[PDB]
Design a protein around this ligand. Sequence first.
Ligand SMILES: [Cl-]
Ligand SMILES: [Cl-]
Ligand SMILES: [Cl-]
Ligand SMILES: [Cl-]
Ligand SMILES: [Cl-]
Ligand SMILES: [Cs+]
Ligand SMILES: [Cs+]
Ligand SMILES: [Cs+]
Ligand SMILES: [Cs+]
Ligand SMILES: [Cs+]
Ligand SMILES: [Cs+]
Ligand SMILES: [Cs+]
Ligand SMILES: [Cs+]
Ligand SMILES: [Cs+]
Ligand SMILES: [Cs+]
Ligand SMILES: [Cs+]
Ligand SMILES: [Cs+]
Ligand SMILES: [Cs+]
Ligand SMILES: [Cs+]
Ligand SMILES: [Cs+]
Ligand SMILES: [Cs+]
Ligand SMILES: [Cs+]
Ligand SMILES: [Cs+]
Ligand SMILES: [Cs+]
Ligand SMILES: [Cs+]
Ligand SMILES: [Cs+]
Ligand SMILES: [Cs+]
Ligand SMILES: [Cs+]
Ligand SMILES: [Cs+]
Ligand SMILES: [Cs+]
Ligand SMILES: [Cs+]
Ligand SMILES: [Cs+]
Lengths: 310, 311, 311, 311, 311
Amino acid sequence: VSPPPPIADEPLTVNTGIYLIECYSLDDKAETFKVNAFLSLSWKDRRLADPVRSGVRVKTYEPEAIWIPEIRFVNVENARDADVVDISVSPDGTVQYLERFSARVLSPLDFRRYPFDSQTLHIYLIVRSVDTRNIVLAVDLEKVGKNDDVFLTGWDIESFTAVVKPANFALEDRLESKLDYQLRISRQYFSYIPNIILPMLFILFISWTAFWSTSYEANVTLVVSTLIAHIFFNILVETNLPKTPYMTYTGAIIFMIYLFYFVAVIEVTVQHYLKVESQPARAASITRASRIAFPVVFLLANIILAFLFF
Amino acid sequence: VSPPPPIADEPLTVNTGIYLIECYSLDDKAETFKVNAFLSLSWKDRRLAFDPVRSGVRVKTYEPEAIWIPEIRFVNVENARDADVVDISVSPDGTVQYLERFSARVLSPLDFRRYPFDSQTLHIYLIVRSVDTRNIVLAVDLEKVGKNDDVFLTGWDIESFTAVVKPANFALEDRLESKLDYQLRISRQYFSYIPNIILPMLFILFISWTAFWSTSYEANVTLVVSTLIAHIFFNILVETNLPKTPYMTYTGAIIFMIYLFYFVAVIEVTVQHYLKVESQPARAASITRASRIAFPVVFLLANIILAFLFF
Amino acid sequence: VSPPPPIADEPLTVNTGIYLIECYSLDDKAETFKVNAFLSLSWKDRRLAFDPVRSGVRVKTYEPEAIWIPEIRFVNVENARDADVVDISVSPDGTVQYLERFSARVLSPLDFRRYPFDSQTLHIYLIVRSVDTRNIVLAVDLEKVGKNDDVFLTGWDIESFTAVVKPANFALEDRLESKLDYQLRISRQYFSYIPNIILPMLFILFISWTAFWSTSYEANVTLVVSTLIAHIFFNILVETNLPKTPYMTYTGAIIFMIYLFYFVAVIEVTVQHYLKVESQPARAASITRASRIAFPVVFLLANIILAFLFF
Amino acid sequence: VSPPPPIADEPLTVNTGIYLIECYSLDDKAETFKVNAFLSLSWKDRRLAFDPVRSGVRVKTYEPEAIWIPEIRFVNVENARDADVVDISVSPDGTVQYLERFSARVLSPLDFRRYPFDSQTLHIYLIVRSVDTRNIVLAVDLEKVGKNDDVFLTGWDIESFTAVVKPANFALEDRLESKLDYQLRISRQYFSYIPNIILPMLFILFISWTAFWSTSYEANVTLVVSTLIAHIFFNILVETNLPKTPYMTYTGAIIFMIYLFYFVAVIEVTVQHYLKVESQPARAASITRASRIAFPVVFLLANIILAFLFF
Amino acid sequence: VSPPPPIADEPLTVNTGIYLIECYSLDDKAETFKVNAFLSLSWKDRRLAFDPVRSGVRVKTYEPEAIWIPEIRFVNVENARDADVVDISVSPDGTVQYLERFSARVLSPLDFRRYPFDSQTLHIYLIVRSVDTRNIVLAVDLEKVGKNDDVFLTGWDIESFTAVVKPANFALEDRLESKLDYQLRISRQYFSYIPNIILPMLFILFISWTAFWSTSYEANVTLVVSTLIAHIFFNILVETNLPKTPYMTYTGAIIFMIYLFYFVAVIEVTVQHYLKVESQPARAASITRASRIAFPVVFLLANIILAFLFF
Ligand SMILES: [Cl-]
Ligand SMILES: [Cl-]
Ligand SMILES: [Cl-]
Ligand SMILES: [Cl-]
Ligand SMILES: [Cl-]
Ligand SMILES: [Cs+]
Ligand SMILES: [Cs+]
Ligand SMILES: [Cs+]
Ligand SMILES: [Cs+]
Ligand SMILES: [Cs+]
Ligand SMILES: [Cs+]
Ligand SMILES: [Cs+]
Ligand SMILES: [Cs+]
Ligand SMILES: [Cs+]
Ligand SMILES: [Cs+]
Ligand SMILES: [Cs+]
Ligand SMILES: [Cs+]
Ligand SMILES: [Cs+]
Ligand SMILES: [Cs+]
Ligand SMILES: [Cs+]
Ligand SMILES: [Cs+]
Ligand SMILES: [Cs+]
Ligand SMILES: [Cs+]
Ligand SMILES: [Cs+]
Ligand SMILES: [Cs+]
Ligand SMILES: [Cs+]
Ligand SMILES: [Cs+]
Ligand SMILES: [Cs+]
Ligand SMILES: [Cs+]
Ligand SMILES: [Cs+]
Ligand SMILES: [Cs+]
Ligand SMILES: [Cs+]
């Protein structure tokens, strides 16, 4: 088989569509997601073109019987697992191809606002031109969509749209036609509140009870113990995320909280030192100031951080 | 090969059945389960009809390639099913009986609201897309729906395996699609959660309450802080066995509430020490004595409220 | 190809054998094990009879596609076996001798009641479904059932590999099925559990009992709470190596019971401090002295009771 | 099919090119990375030559099976590459232009000496074996070597993708082999190691040094021992992200050295308490005051020495 | 195709060779390693002989399907090898030279007795099953046994790759089997275990011994209990990198013994406090002073005894 010949000099237009059946396994660390979808293709092959004499409105072909464009995905781990569903030819020779495929897609994620982040996942469709003729891709919006039951655990699916204009470019001395299918998602931040955020705030506030205690030994226990629990939360959080060349919102708060523990240790030390030196009136002034300063600076620093990130 | 032609304008009815051989790997975090089953298909193909007398046979056995077979797929699968055709049998009137053994990884959402005292309805959705030649509709042959008695899903009790007899017929890309819903009802075996997570978590909490019979601030700080850290370990342990949910689970609610009890116990321990240092131990004693009753009482009532909201 | 025809009315007997080459990956949590073995099959197909004089050869070698081969499957597998045909030898009378080497991941439930001092009977179920033309039945050729001497299952001792000679013949989806049960008896190597989990867990418990020779409440709180936390770590460690069971395991029972000992030790430490503060140390001393004997004695008797209930 | 015959006695030159589409999964522990790329091949096959005029075609397309194609392999791969032929074009003189898209898991050793401030040269080795008919040699077509601008390797910066133009020709199993070295230069994005591991580890160390402004032995023991345990947690965390090396890494050196600082701080805390108990606090005060300067000073100088030895 | 016929009554000798290209993924817990290698085979097939002067061709290249090839398998593999035929060459006398490149996951038991100062002999067992026509025997062509210089197994030193030249010929299921043993000798790179596990574990133990220069019971309890917990973390860390063994490993022995030292140190700290409370500090002082010498001395001698028993 060979490509359909051009009537004039026009490129062959392959109309495309992707209909999402299943979305699963959005892996934050790997920056991948798995997809199960319908891929629809349409092009004119005049060699395949009478409905009156044939009495048949449509002809069904097997993939091997006809010429089919070599369509690939750019951002996949391995080539897609595809099963042809149907091939239908209209009297004028317009071919309608439908396959169901599954693929693991590589799509970078922006963790800057984590866990209050949104992402635009991409599925890039591509075709390489043949020596005989140039192949160009188009979007049939009537064949772009997603099943209502499509659920991505821990995310809300906003939209699935295609950028209608392909990116046509040369690659290894041939033309290449690339389409961008976009899946907009937003993270379900709910669970982060009772599981990570609030527990982390509770332990921090517990360290601040040391500002109402003169017992150095109890203070050391309060600040050091809670710091260790903060380290456990820091480790827990970093296990759910990849290493980023930037600060994430959570990372910033987690990092800042270390400074609060560090300054609380200095305060607890200074307080004890003065007490030992028979200067408790002064220690009392530092401790009383700390009772206001620590929560106030904590609130303002968080307002500043939320402002820089959102 | 082409589909059986319609005598009038009727849709072709494909009778289906699923017989479960194996159920394994119910992954809570992934919301998947693996299945090994028999898939049975039956439809009328008049072009295959024969006379028993003339042929000298009452049944005809074909190879899948020799005859037309409907393109049946599963909606909620990761990848297409691994299937091996077992038998194809044709009766004199052209009634085809197809049997395949398949294995598949199924995506089926789980409701964790009552975890670990939860029940689930797992779904296996069978689907067929119509052809230009004709419309294909699915039906359930109840005589061919079932499960082996030895089918066990580790950590779960299997209640029933039934099919919703009426298919969901709908248009998808200007073609009729016919969808059947096979339902596997399961209930979680909550037993092990009691000695492994629930009771240990209650023991450490009750141990933090011994601080209400102690005037030693340093010992109290050690009791409340140490047990809080152990509670954090249980919280982490629990969340590793579960996916992130946009709602509160029953266990999650109790785990979260217990933090409030630790937080208030720290305030009490602090207030008690502060008053002692201020030479007002009589007040401190009143707060501590009240706490001995208040903490277990509020804990019990809060748990009755939570169990009520969840069950 | 179609099945061999019956001389009279008898079912077709397919003689089977499994020879284990490798055993690996016994996964306790998954209740699976991987197997690499020879599967031997033998049946008479008179349509393959030949004259050694005419054909030159005394035994014919065939390709699987060239002749009729029974559709033999495993019941308790995750996916269909990975099989490679080693030989298909046909003798003059038409007796087929089929040999394949296969690898498969087998689902076989495990009884954890006596863990880590448990023994198991793993099963490999061979099955054949009957056809319309004729009924197929399985048999065991004991001469072709065995295992390589080098077969080792990491962390287990292999006792025996035998087959239940009588197949289980039954109806399934309006056809006959013939099922054979191959049994691999194994016993767990409990050795490593002693220095890694059991003894460390006993040492920390005995360390908490040193609080019965101390009047220091703050040190006692540190002794009992610290060791309890270490016990939680061991509890977590143990539960990671096991699936969730609707019953108590031997280890689980001991681990759970040890929490009660920590809980009562905290009460004792609290009661002792309370009396000391109330200026009644003579009483506190009587409780502490009694605890020095009571704790180890009750621990020993409770363990004798548990070992008795479990073994 | 057989190799193109030599006009004289020359070896057959196969021109190669690799164009990277995707780079992912650089696994430090495994010392592997996954690659998705275009592999281009070019050679002259006189037997396929044609006249453009009498043919009416300027180029001729063939299926891989129709013509002779060199058996090109990768040396440093886990399994053979997953390849799909994209195009095979033949020009009038019989110059074949082959293009495939492949994916492979590549084994490439990493030097962790300067971790996490390290750079690496990943290798993709292309190989061809000679035939008895003729010697097959590889060449680099620089015009066909490159990478997509969107190529991102999570946690790394990609510097360059170049090929060593001169192949390494050598004998292997009595046939000559022609090997090309494609090099991907990368540098680690060390950013995240600063707020996640480096700074937290420094904070806990500095917190242990507050024991030099405390006379309370019990508080000092708590400060030094608690922070040491947190340092152990960071040590464990770091070693989980790395393979076992027969050398010291930069991070490993700092982590190891910090243990010595904790060990000496414990000795100081012990010596201080011992003297205090012996009624010699003046002395203990001299040791403690010296320690306040000595510990940070020795820490700074030791780090300058280490950075010097490693960079 | 059928096997080459015997000139007299001789078995067919298949000469073998394995050339290692890649060694990776030595998994201690699984007792497996992955291999990528060349497998070379050579046998005489007279039915393929040709005249060198008449033919003009010195060697004839065949496709695997065109000629008879012996069914060579690996005994100790998880699944069948992934193999790609590289070349098939026939010399005038009919000597066949076969070459394939394969990849396989090999099961090979490991002896952990001296871990992490252990050495291993990994095995790759090559096997052939005889045919009815004739017996097939394996031989080693030492000229075709080897390994690439760049072959690196992360965390190990590769010593040698040799083959036991004499095959193990035996009957299995009424046919002869010919087995060859290819041995890869490796020694563990113990370096990293010193700064990561050994030294940190010794530091915490020595820190527990500072309690012998302290009269503070509460500080002593904190020193001994805290370091014991850190020792538990190292015990857990070590056991995660190892499978469960029915014997003691060298590291396991030291780790286990260190628990006894912690246990006795707790007894000493308890006895010391008890005597102090009983107003007998002169005695407590004698026990504490003795402990300062006894603990390090008994530790050193016990380690000399253990090293002696293990090495
Ligand atoms: Cl693709
Ligand atoms: Cl499917
Ligand atoms: Cl099977
Ligand atoms: Cl390759
Ligand atoms: Cl093999
Ligand atoms: Cs085609
Ligand atoms: Cs594929
Ligand atoms: Cs496919
Ligand atoms: Cs829809
Ligand atoms: Cs068909
Ligand atoms: Cs499949
Ligand atoms: Cs299949
Ligand atoms: Cs039924
Ligand atoms: Cs049943
Ligand atoms: Cs239609
Ligand atoms: Cs303490
Ligand atoms: Cs067959
Ligand atoms: Cs299979
Ligand atoms: Cs196979
Ligand atoms: Cs036997
Ligand atoms: Cs045997
Ligand atoms: Cs070819
Ligand atoms: Cs491949
Ligand atoms: Cs392929
Ligand atoms: Cs380039
Ligand atoms: Cs580019
Ligand atoms: Cs040669
Ligand atoms: Cs062959
Ligand atoms: Cs294979
Ligand atoms: Cs292969
Ligand atoms: Cs030789
Ligand atoms: Cs070599």
